[PDB]
């Protein structure tokens, strides 16, 4: 339970104190979506089911579509600026 907690919490602390670099916010969020997995997946493992794995494959997919949508949001954020 340690590793998913620590990836999530260090990603959270990385999100807070590192605003002004903006891509770093995305990738800390992406590792957050990994950390929720690393806790939930071993809960499926310890609890003898794939019901947590059922939620897990969905949150894999939703992390994906998050990276699909929000990066187009980024491209919109930089088209109207130059840099």
């Amino acid at each position: 339970m340690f590793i998913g907690t620590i990836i999530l919490v260090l990603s959270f602390l990385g999100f807070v104190f590192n605003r002004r670099n903006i891509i770093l916010a995305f990738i800390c969020l992406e590792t957050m979506l990994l950390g929720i997995n690393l806790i939930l997946l071993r809960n499926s493992v310890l609890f003898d089911d794939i019901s947590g794995s059922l939620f897990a494959i969905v949150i894999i997919i939703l992390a994906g579509v998050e990276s699909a949508i929000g990066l187009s949001l980024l491209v919109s954020y930089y088209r109207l600026r130059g840099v």
Binding site: M1, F15, L33, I39, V58, V65
Partner: protein, 469 residues
């Protein structure tokens, strides 16, 4: 019949040119009207709060949620009806308020996202649908791309939406880490006695709530609600409210919450005093949107509150909806327009609205009286029945801070009327064009609802008693 609309219409928009964008939205307007009219009778699907669990313990259809399920179609008819109809036949109103190609698609995607929360039993369907509506509001903010405030607000909304994505997911993960369910039969007043599921369900509640403007997370939604264009905000300050609040009121997962009560107090206080020294109208309007959700936090605390919730919902989703459309009308009479995406900002700009007409002013006056609880209005009995639920279960200090919040609120709601009826020095005598008829007729309807809504006070109580119990 949402999906049955969407799968046809995105093929239809892809096979369409750019000048059809009004007519597609006119089609969807009439479509949702006929969905409501021709299929209204499904309230007959219960008689004694008879609740269905559909798609196998996954969705939940009941006496309650059918109402919100109707309500979202009702408001979407209005929102669509803004787009599809011209305001005037002017050059100004076609370089303003012209919809994009993909916009009306994203609305029905969002309504799918909103309805699949309120009808959701499962946490997994909850999570899918909050991601769905979060992506919806991401795009619907970012769709009017050639505005710097629009894209900046889209990013701003994006990162807090990501935190609440992971926070709700961590709450679901923790609840699963102590229990092998995801549904909510597993509470049933027995595990609550013998297991500390307080903090976990509290952390579920907070993560669901902080997509509203709940006062620890306060400034950022307000910065959005001004940096958006004036059109998109009348949609996105409504749907994420009433979707998840109907979820949270449907399942009272935090009863006697120490956390939610203190946050409700702080919400009402800082929203009421945040409405004070402000001259930007989108701000002022968003803080009204905050304090009314402040009342929502109060209705989250109670047990068995399906009256005061739904009645205050149909209060709020009419009044809060209509005051936008009033100031959408009001920008024709003003003397200075900037900012093609967002024409009015400063509340000073509608200085002489009564010497333009009396009747848009009177219609504005009664709806701004409707936010402050003026007793012959529909906006009153919301607060009345809130307080009939509050002292029902002894939230005493909550009631007196509600009174403080109501007074400090009603100070700044009248600031609109302080502006609106004054001298202008340059009065209209003759406009060439009129306002497009049925677009304004919708506002006439929405305002006779608020004024003459105490008529059906009795019949709605009878429908409440028979159907919802």
């Amino acid at each position: 019949m949402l999906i049955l609309a969407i799968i046809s219409l995105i093929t239809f928009v892809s096979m369409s040119k750019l000048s059809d964008n009004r007519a597609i939205i006119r089609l969807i307007n009439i479509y949702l009207i006929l969905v409501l009219v021709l299929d209204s009778f499904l309230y007959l699907l219960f008689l004694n709060n008879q609740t269905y669990t559909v798609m196998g313990e996954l969705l939940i259809f009941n006496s309650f949620t059918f109402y919100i399920d109707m309500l979202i179609y009702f408001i979407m008819i209005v929102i669509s009806s803004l787009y599809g109809y011209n305001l005037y036949n002017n050059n100004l109103y076609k370089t303003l308020f012209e919809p994009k190609k993909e916009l009306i698609i994203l609305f029905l995607i969002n309504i799918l996202g909103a309805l699949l929360i309120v009808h959701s039993n499962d946490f997994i369907t909850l999570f899918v649908a909050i991601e769905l509506q979060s992506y919806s509001i991401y795009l619907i903010t970012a769709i009017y791309n050639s505005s710097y405030k629009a894209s900046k607000a889209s990013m701003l909304y994006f990162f807090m939406g990501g935190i609440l994505s992971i926070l709700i997911a961590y709450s679901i993960n923790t609840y699963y880490s102590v229990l092998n369910s995801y549904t909510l039969h597993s509470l049933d007043s027995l595990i609550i006695n013998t297991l500390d599921l307080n903090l976990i369900l509290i952390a579920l509640s907070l993560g669901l709530l902080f997509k509203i403007g709940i006062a620890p997370l306060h400034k950022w939604l307000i910065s959005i609600y001004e940096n958006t264009p004036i059109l998109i905000t009348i949609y996105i300050s409504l749907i994420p409210k009433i979707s998840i609040l109907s979820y949270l009121v449907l399942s009272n997962i935090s009863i006697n919450s120490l956390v939610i009560s203190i946050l409700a107090i702080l919400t009402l206080l800082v929203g009421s005093v945040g409405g004070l020294l402000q001259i930007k109208i989108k701000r002022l309007l968003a803080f009204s949107g905050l304090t009314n959700a402040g009342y929502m936090m109060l209705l989250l605390l109670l047990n068995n509150n399906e009256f005061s919730y739904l009645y205050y919902i149909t209060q709020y989703s009419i009044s809060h909806l209509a005051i936008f459309m009033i100031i959408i009308f009001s920008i024709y009479y003003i003397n200075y327009i900037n900012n093609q995406y967002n024409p009015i900002i400063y509340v000073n700009q509608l200085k002489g609205l009564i010497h333009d007409n009396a009747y848009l002013v009177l219609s504005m006056a009664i709806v701004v009286f409707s936010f402050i609880g003026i007793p012959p209005l529909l906006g009153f009995f919301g607060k009345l029945n809130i307080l009939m639920s509050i002292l029902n279960n002894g939230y005493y200090f909550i009631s007196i801070v509600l009174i403080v919040a109501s007074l400090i609120s009603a100070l700044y709601y009248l600031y609109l009327l302080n502006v609106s009826i004054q001298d202008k020095n340059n009065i209209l005598i003759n406009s060439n064009e009129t306002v497009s008829s049925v677009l304004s007729y919708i506002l006439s309807s929405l305002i006779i609802l608020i004024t003459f809504g105490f008529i059906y006070n009795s019949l709605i109580i009878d429908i409440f008693n028979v159907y919802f119990n």
